[PDB]
């Protein structure tokens, strides 16, 4: 119903219908508020290929970036007290294996 003439003087301007005319079985499917079948400047198949192609390419590039990350020429960040053992979880009655940091 979206692609009906918007300049004809319909009895129902919003639905673009004429009194007494046969009504399409799926009228409530096409009420200009729902799926429409208006022709597009670009073909359906080309649109599908372009949309799908872009998405597939973006996903595969993101996976490649996961495989090949980016970082800086630095070592790991160092934290003083046994890698902050007491303030991360706690467990003060186990005496963990100490870790000591290398000064250069």
């Amino acid at each position: 119903q979206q692609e009906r003439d918007p300049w004809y003087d319909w009895d129902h301007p919003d639905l673009r219908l004429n009194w007494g005319e046969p009504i399409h079985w799926d009228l409530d499917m096409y009420i200009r508020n729902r799926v429409d079948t208006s022709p597009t400047p670009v073909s359906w198949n080309t649109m599908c290929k372009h949309l799908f192609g872009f998405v597939a390419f973006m996903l595969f590039m993101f996976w490649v970036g996961e495989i090949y990350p980016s970082y800086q020429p630095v070592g790991p960040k160092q934290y003083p007290y046994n890698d902050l053992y007491l303030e991360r979880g706690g467990d003060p009655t186990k005496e963990p294996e100490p870790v000591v940091h290398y000064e250069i």
Binding site: M61, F62, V64, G65, E66, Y68, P69, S70, Y71, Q72
Partner: protein, 165 residues
């Protein structure tokens, strides 16, 4: 917080333009408004500069730090490239808006009804103008630190946001 200010002001300028041209929204039918209506012009220019992370502007204190933090983090290369291209495209459509709305010859219908002389519009726009000029500095200098800074950086990596913009 920064985007709130400058994007709200950008919509204010767009709405003023739309109202002044008889509810016309398309940019193909708006031409030379830099002189025909200058307060909206300067507000939109300041908002566009703020949006593009111009130095010492509301958008600087957030967007520049975003770019710096993404550039020096163990993340995807693709995501970083997409972010840089997005920044370039941001500058690009800001330029598109300014060029097609303010620079050329007029393209609106002959009956000119352009008018800004209303105190409500001027005051509302100028309050957010002052915000989009100074709030970034004020808020950044008033809040306590919450993350480790990126003190030392390669020179080309420090300028990358400005270069792409």
């Amino acid at each position: 917080c920064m985007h709130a200010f400058f994007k709200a002001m950008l919509f204010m300028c767009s709405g003023s333009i739309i109202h002044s041209l008889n509810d016309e929204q398309d940019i193909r039918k708006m031409g030379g408004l830099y002189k025909a209506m200058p307060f909206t012009t300067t507000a939109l220019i300041i908002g566009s500069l703020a949006l593009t992370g111009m130095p010492y502007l509301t958008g600087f204190y957030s967007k520049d730090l975003i770019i710096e933090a993404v550039n020096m983090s163990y993340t995807n290369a693709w995501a970083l490239l997409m972010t840089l291209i997005a920044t370039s495209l941001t500058a690009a459509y800001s330029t598109r808006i300014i060029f097609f709305a303010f620079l050329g010859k007029p393209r609106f219908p002959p009956l000119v009804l352009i008018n800004e002389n209303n105190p409500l519009l001027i005051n509302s726009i100028k309050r957010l103008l002052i915000g989009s000029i100074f709030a970034g500095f004020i808020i950044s200098n008033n809040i306590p630190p919450m993350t480790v800074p990126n003190t030392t950086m390669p020179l080309y990596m420090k300028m990358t946001a400005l270069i792409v913009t």
